[PDB]
Design a binder for this molecule. Sequence first.
Ligand SMILES: C[C@]12CC[C@H](O)C[C@@H]1CC[C@@H]1[C@@H]2CC[C@]2(C)C(=O)CC[C@@H]12
Length: 279
Amino acid sequence: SDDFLWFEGIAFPTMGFRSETLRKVRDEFVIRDEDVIILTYPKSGTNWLAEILCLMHSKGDAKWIQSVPIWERSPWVESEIGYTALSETESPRLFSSHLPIQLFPKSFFSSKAKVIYLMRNPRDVLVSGYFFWKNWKFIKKPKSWEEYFEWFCQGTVLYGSWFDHIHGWMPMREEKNFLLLSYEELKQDTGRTIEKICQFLGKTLEPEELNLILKNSSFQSMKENKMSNYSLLSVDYVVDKTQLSGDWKNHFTVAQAEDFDKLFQEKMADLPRELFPWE
Ligand SMILES: C[C@]12CC[C@H](O)C[C@@H]1CC[C@@H]1[C@@H]2CC[C@]2(C)C(=O)CC[C@@H]12
């Protein structure tokens, strides 16, 4: 039946989600000014950012971060457990969300809460997305990477158009409660970033703590996490236990990348070029 949980014109996973809830989230859910949400189009960096911040509160000690699945560390409001937990939870609070602007709880535009929106080069999101979602149980699947490429360049995928999703919050980049990051700068120099974060979030830590943090927060340490990699995720969620590679240039065919360039051009043309590190 459909193969996707359609809500408000947007594809959602069947398992672990619920329309009533996606609504119990927009015209019902209550956001506090002392809340933290990592805003991300799926497969853009959430897990990392999540760990980083998680490290903040733990001030380096990766003990916690290690023995707790991220969905628990930073729940997804939109999701059942996410909502279920988030609500029966004490403040302050931190959570993730892939929701496009228009689906985000209205109670946020009133409050002053702090939201971080880590944006990532779409081409790499397309790839990572592909492999990941093709191994996700109970949802339409592309018969071919050429097909997934088609789906993505039209939005016809989970959580809608990445273009859309971006165009949606960019106009909100200037608020004092919205910090816009990007994959590039989170990798090409994890230092700055962490600064802007603790800064924007309004926090400081010992030097020997910012030390311990930096350690457990660089790519390696990250792409080596048995939590930030899901690991022990119900086999019902994934089609293959092992699947649990490469840069978008190792995946985009020359024509594709080409077509995809005329795409970003036309589509993003109404925005500041400076807005995208990646070429
Ligand atoms: C797909 C995803 C949100 C899009 C992410 O960047 C990839 C994440 C994998 C783990 C999923 C999560 C949505 C909510 C789920 C379904 C849960 O509640 C437990 C497993 C969770």
